[PDB]
Amino acid sequence: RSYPCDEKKQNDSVIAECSNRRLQEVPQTVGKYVTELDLSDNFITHITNESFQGLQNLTKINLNHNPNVNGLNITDGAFLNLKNLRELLLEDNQLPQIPSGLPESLTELSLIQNNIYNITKEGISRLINLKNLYLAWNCYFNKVCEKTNIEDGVFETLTNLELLSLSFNSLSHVPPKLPSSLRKLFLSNTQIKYISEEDFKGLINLTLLDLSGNCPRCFNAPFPCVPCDGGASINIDRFAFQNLTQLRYLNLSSTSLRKINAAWFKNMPHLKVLDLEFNYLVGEIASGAFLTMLPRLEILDLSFNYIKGSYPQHINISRNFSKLLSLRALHLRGYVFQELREDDFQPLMQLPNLSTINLGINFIKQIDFKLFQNFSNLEIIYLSENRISPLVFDPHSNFYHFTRPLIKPQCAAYGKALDLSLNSIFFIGPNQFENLPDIACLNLSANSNAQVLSGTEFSAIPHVKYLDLTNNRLDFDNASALTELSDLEVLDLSYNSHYFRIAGVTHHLEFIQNFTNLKVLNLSHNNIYTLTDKYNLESKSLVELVFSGNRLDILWNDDDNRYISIFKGLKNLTRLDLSLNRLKHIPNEAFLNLPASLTELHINDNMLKFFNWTLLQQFPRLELLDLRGNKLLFLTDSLSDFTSSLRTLLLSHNRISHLPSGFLSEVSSLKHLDLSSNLLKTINKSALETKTTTKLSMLELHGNPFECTCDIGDFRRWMDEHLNVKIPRLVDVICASPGDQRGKSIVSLE
Amino acid sequence: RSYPCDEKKQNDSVIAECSNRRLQEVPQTVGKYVTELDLSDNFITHITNESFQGLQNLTKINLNHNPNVNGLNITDGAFLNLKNLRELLLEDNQLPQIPSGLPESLTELSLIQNNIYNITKEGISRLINLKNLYLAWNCYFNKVCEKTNIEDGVFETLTNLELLSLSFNSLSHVPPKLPSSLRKLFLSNTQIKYISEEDFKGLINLTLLDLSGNCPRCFNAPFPCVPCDGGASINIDRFAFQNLTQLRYLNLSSTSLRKINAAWFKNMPHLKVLDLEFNYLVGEIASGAFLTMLPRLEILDLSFNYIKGSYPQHINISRNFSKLLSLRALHLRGYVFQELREDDFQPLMQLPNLSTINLGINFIKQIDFKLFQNFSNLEIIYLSENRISPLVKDTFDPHSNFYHFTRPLIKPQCAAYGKALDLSLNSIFFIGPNQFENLPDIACLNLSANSNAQVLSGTEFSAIPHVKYLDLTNNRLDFDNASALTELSDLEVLDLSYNSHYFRIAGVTHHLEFIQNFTNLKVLNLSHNNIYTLTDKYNLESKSLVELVFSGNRLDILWNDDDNRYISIFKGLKNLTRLDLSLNRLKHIPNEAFLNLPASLTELHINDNMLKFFNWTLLQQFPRLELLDLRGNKLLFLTDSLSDFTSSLRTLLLSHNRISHLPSGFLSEVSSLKHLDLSSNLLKTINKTKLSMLELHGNPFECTCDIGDFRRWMDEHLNVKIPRLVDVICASPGDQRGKSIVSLE
Ligand SMILES: *[C@@H]1O[C@H](CO)[C@@H](O[C@@H]2O[C@H](CO)[C@@H](O[C@@H]3O[C@H](CO[C@H]4O[C@H](CO)[C@@H](O)[C@H](O)[C@@H]4O)[C@@H](O)[C@H](O[C@H]4O[C@H](CO)[C@@H](O)[C@H](O)[C@@H]4O)[C@@H]3O)[C@H](O)[C@H]2NC(C)=O)[C@H](O)[C@H]1NC(C)=O
Ligand SMILES: *[C@@H]1O[C@H](CO)[C@@H](O[C@@H]2O[C@H](CO)[C@@H](O[C@@H]3O[C@H](CO)[C@@H](O)[C@H](O[C@H]4O[C@H](CO)[C@@H](O)[C@H](O)[C@@H]4O)[C@@H]3O)[C@H](O)[C@H]2NC(C)=O)[C@H](O)[C@H]1NC(C)=O
Ligand SMILES: *[C@@H]1O[C@H](CO)[C@@H](O[C@@H]2O[C@H](CO)[C@@H](O[C@@H]3O[C@H](CO[C@H]4O[C@H](CO)[C@@H](O)[C@H](O)[C@@H]4O)[C@@H](O)[C@H](O)[C@@H]3O)[C@H](O)[C@H]2NC(C)=O)[C@H](O)[C@H]1NC(C)=O
Ligand SMILES: *[C@@H]1O[C@H](CO)[C@@H](O[C@@H]2O[C@H](CO)[C@@H](O[C@@H]3O[C@H](CO[C@H]4O[C@H](CO)[C@@H](O)[C@H](O)[C@@H]4O)[C@@H](O)[C@H](O)[C@@H]3O)[C@H](O)[C@H]2NC(C)=O)[C@H](O)[C@H]1NC(C)=O
Ligand SMILES: *[C@@H]1O[C@H](CO)[C@@H](O[C@@H]2O[C@H](CO)[C@@H](O)[C@H](O)[C@H]2NC(C)=O)[C@H](O)[C@H]1NC(C)=O
Ligand SMILES: *[C@@H]1O[C@H](CO)[C@@H](O[C@@H]2O[C@H](CO)[C@@H](O)[C@H](O)[C@H]2NC(C)=O)[C@H](O)[C@H]1NC(C)=O
Ligand SMILES: Cc1cc(-c2ccnc3cc(O)ccc23)ccc1O
Ligand SMILES: Cc1cc(-c2ccnc3cc(O)ccc23)ccc1O
Ligand SMILES: *[C@@H]1O[C@H](CO)[C@@H](O)[C@H](O)[C@H]1NC(C)=O
Ligand SMILES: *[C@@H]1O[C@H](CO)[C@@H](O)[C@H](O)[C@H]1NC(C)=O
Ligand SMILES: *[C@@H]1O[C@H](CO)[C@@H](O)[C@H](O)[C@H]1NC(C)=O
Ligand SMILES: *[C@@H]1O[C@H](CO)[C@@H](O)[C@H](O)[C@H]1NC(C)=O
């Protein structure tokens, strides 16, 4: 049983997760098998040539973010003993210099987010097996750091080097004598205002170059930002990229470009991805000679090139966009304009592989929506944060191109996706969706939409499968609401409320029944407290109901018992979420009227005083029961009498102070038991049993006020007699008493 | 010391506040001199005589909401003995009928929210001194009560009756034989679909009639709603209001009206307030004969008469609006239309007293703003929830109002400075160069929640340079330039709550130099701006500022700076008297950082942080401090010599901390302290004052004989008010656990 690290197999080697454990030094208790050691985010202050003796087989060490809340102190040759060390991460350690005497075996070294101002031969030129070297974020807006000093030729000996990152340092010019093995060169935010013909000569293998944030566009910049003199653009010689024939990725975001030299791409016939966000290229977008030079470009980003003070009627798209034959995704966020006409996008209608058009955040008032029918492979039409109306820190993330999917994958997987969230569609006009292609995934979130749904509003796109109506003011009282969407599978009505935001609103949920393949319904935070004519939800198809943030406390304390069968008619339900419903006590017969099909039941974050364990008998398929964050005091002593199906039982954040004699005997079915953050002082001999034996494999106990006398010795031995039962976060399974033990782990005892 | 009630004399009266105290019966422990008794929101199940015995001096009893989680049981003549009882409130008691044998002395009776289906002579006909009778919400969507049965003439004997409310009951018609003393008749949501000539005949003293919600407009209704068949309008005879010559208030909201008979107002020359919200009067608003009949109307409400599925280009306002010579406020919310032209409001431009135009929630895309210059007395232009853009080109509770939103349209504090324009929740995503041209002189401007990302540079507001109160909350503003907003040289109040970057990314930096440039700036609210560094300038400065709200930022980071750059951050606010540093995740304030707060402070809030220690000695540097608020932290100890450190402190708030010991020195005495709040701490006991309030509820008191000391000190100081005694609870020993410390020996 490992301590303090969680050790485990990964692929065909063994790993030690040892992060975020308040460790003040490198433990000497790591398993002998461990080849990768993550000690990030701890309180470690020193590394000597002894910290790692006893582990000569280490391949990888992560020491990032040490220490927390002076700096990390590393003796010379601390690591040169470790002859197999390939990867060493030393990020955010406040290193004042490259540690000296690093092992020759290193293939990857990260020294991101330190105070290293000098890059010397002493430090790295020996590391001839480096493939990837990360030196970003060392000299940026720090009064200490005037400029980064790169010893002439320090990289020239690194003849296997493929990735060099020096982004977020002040370099003023591209350092000379870079090895010809370089594939990716990151020089973002380095104050390189001029790129000569000489800078990238010799880098005939280069596939990526990042020069973003040199002569930034600082208008409305979140972080400090220093334009070039007179907001001039980065200055790139005409022949700067002539020998970069392999370049696939070019990032020129935020270089204040007003014009792009088509000659830059003369010898760059493979360019795949071009980022030109945060420039001034409204003009170039209109004319755009450079566009004729990019027949293999797959991703173009031209976002946030808007002109301050301007809200032009029209977008002006060069006809040259038609030469981007390989284009898969065009990002045009934050151009900012009023109207989009059919003819404005004519050039793009013939791009055979154009699947994503991103027009988020342009505040467009009007779109001729029929224009989207003229594209053969459009799969993502992203129109969030426009003004359509009713129709009657982290260094390893991308700083300028927001990278998460535009549309949730679960929605887009159904087919063609249109996102009109955060527009002004305050009701669904009778022509809202005419001339749209066949939409499978529609997002109308957060439009202040107060439509009275009656069964006709969506008939021009009747094959929507995933409909996101969250954060609106919708009236779905009519039993015909949304029934024109006979193929609907997923409906999200999270955070819906009345167009008055007033306590008292009633609901009618009869529309649910009409759908024969509706699978997932999310009614979260609808503050549902009463239903009108009908008091039962019904569906033969539904598998998942999310009912969090409503008032089942009121529904089930009804005088007339009108809601005791409220979910029973969901005949195929397997997952049910009744969290955040302010439940104190569920009537016994209300609980028995939940569908017997359930496999997963969540009643977390209510205020349950008691639970009737005996009723689990009516749920022969239940695998997961979640009762976290309640006020429960006792556990039944005979659980195996009530279920042979339950695998996962979550009880953390309750008020349990006692485990029954033979709680976990037999229990039988359980694999995962979570009793963290309860009020246990100890565990019994009798609460532990066997002959048994339990099929248990995880037991969570952290955050209980354990009494570390000799009474707990029973538990400690049972721990060693069941190495197979994992107990995570041992460091947080903490004696609260007696005083001399208070605060230590129960595992450190005699 | 009164218990369980808080008894206070005020004016002639002496109150007993006795509500929300988990009382299972009427205490017999109430001072003989008490005249108002509020017992509302308790667990009381029965009222007898004896239940009020030897309490002739009761004027008023409130028994509402008894009991809580069939109910309140009242014996006949339970109140018969109380010969001065004027006012009796019995709301939400689940009464199945009017209690019998109520005292003749009653002038006000409320029986709202019960199950009274029968109004009988036996119940009320003897109460000949009733002025105000409330019977609303008794037969409302109860299957058991099909209809409210009103005994013929039951009210006719009530010849002093001024107010009758029967709203939210199924009457189907106005009951006959109503007394002529009636001034206010409330008949909302009563299913009265027809009003005859006879119903209101001879109500010559009537000043208010409410008929709202009869034949409701149920489209998009929050509550269950049953139109008339099929959605026909309330039916009001031509002569229904002919003898109502004193009518001032007429509420016809939600009666599905398509047309208004001008004859209705023939004999109603003093009508002041007319509510026509939630009808279908788009047509009538265009033609509007009835408008010629209302020369003294002051408030007209035509809100939410939109036609489903329409978004018409234009609003059509009849010329006859020009006949509303007395109009002070016009409410036209939710008509829903795209464009407002100068000529559309021509009829209103000559109304001499029109001070409020309310066009909230019309989703108007464009307004010819110059039209607002043609009004004499416009003080409130309310344009929230429209769709105005950047301009670039030159040119439940029954006693609340169910259909007319009652709070001020614009915060009084802002409107008091003068002419007020509210453009919150529009689409003004940046301030266009013509945004404010052709506006009148605005003193109060609201631009909240427009997704506005303007880079403020000193020129955006120069067409309205006399703004004194500017609300910019909930936007994405850049105020990095030292010149931001300086064109508003008279600015007194600036609200930047919830501003953040138009990317919503942890990392945004701030420059607050603009603040110094203002000569008259008084109140600055920077709450929830997540401020964690300032660039170049590390000090806020101002000779004028009185109030800085700095909640929901990162003073924990600012004050744990390696080079101590922010040790003087607020030093330079020389006039500061109120400062809010709540919700700044503070664990510890450096001693010299605390001493660098302005010595002018009278009110300092550091609540809801996580303070482990507070250096009491430093209060010496704050000779004006009256109020120190440290609620919701983790503090362990109080100094024992507080009077050494201040003679100014009047209010000290320490609830929700971890204090387990109260020094014998505390009450130094600190003659200054008037209000001490030690609720929700960890006190087990207190042991061996100009103080007037001491809060102790929610401490785990040990009720052994060790608390006897405190108990006596309580009786030796009646002047020291202790609220919520019933919640000052023994947690131990077991046999005491859960009892009030007052019930002990
Ligand atoms: C209204 O309610 C619906 C229904 O609950 C919500 O939508 C669901 O949101 C949940 C959780 O947010 C989504 O569940 C997540 O699915 C992710 C995608 O799964 C990938 O890999 C799995 C492997 O089985 C495949 O099934 C799938 O095809 C994908 O390739 C998972 O990554 C998530 O992982 C979970 O578990 C792991 C470890 O256990 C953790 O790392 C994660 O933190 C996480 O717990 C997760 O299962 C679910 O897919 C959604 N369903 C649908 C239909 O959209 C809405 O979000 C809710 N609306 C609002 C406003 O709240
Ligand atoms: C300028 O544009 C270029 C592209 O032209 C862009 O380069 C990309 O940088 C990002 C961010 O550093 C790289 O993304 C990483 O890729 C590696 C390797 O597969 C992964 O290790 C990373 O994943 C880790 O971190 C993620 C978030 O931090 C986690 O999601 C994950 O769990 C991992 O721990 C990450 O995806 C990307 O590889 C390059 N692109 C190429 C082709 O090399 C560059 O960032 C832009 N510059 C700026 C300043 O914005
Ligand atoms: C139909 O329109 C009617 C107006 O024509 C609405 O009438 C109003 O009904 C409300 C709520 O039931 C009453 O409000 C209560 O009134 C008194 C206030 O008395 C005095 O004290 C305050 C203190 O400042 C002062 O401001 C006032 O001017 C009063 O002098 C209190 O008991 C309550 O707090 C509450 O305000 C209105 O009084 C009543 N108006 C009139 C003139 O009587 C009617 O509610 C509408 N119908 C529906 C269903 O919405
Ligand atoms: C940003 O900070 C601002 C300043 O702190 C916030 O505005 C202040 O909000 C408080 C309430 O939180 C208001 O104080 C209340 O004022 C009312 C009205 O008082 C009236 O009667 C009193 C009697 O003394 C009289 O003195 C006044 O002049 C008024 O006529 C009181 O009834 C309350 O009990 C309380 O004192 C401030 O008035 C208000 N200040 C200003 C300048 O508007 C603002 O809300 C914050 N913004 C956000 C989004 O949180
Ligand atoms: C519909 O659009 C809304 C608004 O953009 C999306 O809501 C965002 O969703 C992501 C993922 O849950 C969150 O991280 C953001 O915080 C959300 N923003 C807001 C303002 O809510 C939503 O995900 C989109 N729906 C689908 C199915 O893609
Ligand atoms: C400006 O407009 C905003 C939005 O209407 C007002 O915000 C309301 O503020 C009150 C009191 O602070 C709250 O009870 C409401 O929740 C707010 N509504 C919203 C949507 O935020 C704000 O008060 C207005 N400012 C002024 C000066 O009147
Ligand atoms: C993308 C974007 C642009 C703008 C904007 C457009 C035009 N002129 C602007 C001027 C500014 O000073 C600030 C922002 C803008 C505003 C909000 C936005 O989200
Ligand atoms: C005041 C208002 C009106 C409307 C609306 C206008 C026109 N036709 C509508 C049709 C609907 O089914 C629902 C709402 C409307 C929507 C939101 C609103 O806030
Ligand atoms: C479009 O995509 C397909 C499939 O990836 C690819 O085979 C084809 O070359 C692409 N067409 C063009 C013109 O790039
Ligand atoms: C119930 O849902 C499951 C999805 O888990 C599916 O296998 C099964 O066929 C469903 N049954 C019905 C009747 O929809
Ligand atoms: C649980 O519920 C049933 C009623 O459904 C009751 O008979 C049984 O004894 C209860 N047990 C407990 C511990 O509540
Ligand atoms: C400081 O505030 C006080 C009290 O509000 C006021 O009298 C005075 O004029 C203010 N001083 C300045 C410079 O604005």
From Swiss-Prot, chain A:
Expressed in myeloid dendritic cells, monocytes, and monocyte-derived dendritic cells. Changing G504D: In IMD98; gain-of-function variant resulting in increased NF-kappa-B activation measured in a reporter assay. Residues 704-750 form the LRRCT domain. One of its GO terms (biological process) is positive regulation of interleukin-6 production. GO terms for cellular component: endolysosome membrane; endoplasmic reticulum membrane; endosome membrane; external side of plasma membrane; Golgi membrane; plasma membrane. Disulfide bonds join C5-C18, C139-C145, C215-C228, C218-C225, C411-C441, C708-C735. Residues 1-750 are extracellular. LRR repeats lie at residues 84-105, 106-126, 129-151, 160-181, 182-202, 205-226, 246-267, 270-292, 296-318, 326-347, 353-374, 377-392, 414-435, 438-459, 463-483, 487-509, 517-538, 541-562, 572-593, 597-617, 621-642, 645-666, 669-690. Ubiquitinated by RNF216; leading to degradation by the proteasome. Proteolytic processing occurs in monocytes and monocyte-derived macrophages by both furin-like proprotein convertase and cathepsins. The cleavage is necessary for dimer formation and subsequent activation. It is a single-pass type I membrane protein. Glycans are attached at residues 11, 49, 57, 73, 118, 205, 243, 251, 316, 320, 353, 374, 443, 478, 514, 522, 572, 612, 684. Activated by RNAs having enough uridines. It is found in: Endosome membrane. Keywords: Disease variant, Disulfide bond, Endosome, Glycoprotein, Immunity, Inflammatory response, Innate immunity, Leucine-rich repeat, Membrane, Receptor, Repeat, Signal, Transmembrane, Transmembrane helix, Ubl conjugation. Changing D475A: Abolishes activation of NF-kappa-B. One of its GO terms (molecular function) is pattern recognition receptor activity. Belongs to the Toll-like receptor family. Homodimer. Interacts with MYD88 via their respective TIR domains. Interacts with UNC93B1. Interacts with BTK. Interacts with SMPDL3B. Endosomal receptor that plays a key role in innate and adaptive immunity. Controls host immune response against pathogens through recognition of RNA degradation products specific to microorganisms that are initially processed by RNASET2. Recognizes GU-rich single-stranded RNA (GU-rich RNA) derived from SARS-CoV-2, SARS-CoV-1 and HIV-1 viruses. Upon binding to agonists, undergoes dimerization that brings TIR domains from the two molecules into direct contact, leading to the recruitment of TIR-containing downstream adapter MYD88 through homotypic interaction. It is linked to Immunodeficiency 98 with autoinflammation, X-linked: An X-linked disorder characterized by onset of recurrent infections associated with lymphoproliferation and autoinflammation in the first decade of life. Mostly males are affected; carrier females may have mild symptoms. Features include mouth ulcers, fever, poor early growth, hepatosplenomegaly, lymphadenopathy, polyarthritis, and non-infectious enteritis. This is Toll-like receptor 8. It comes from Homo sapiens (Human). The gene is TLR8. The chain holds residues 32 to 818 of 1041 of the full protein.
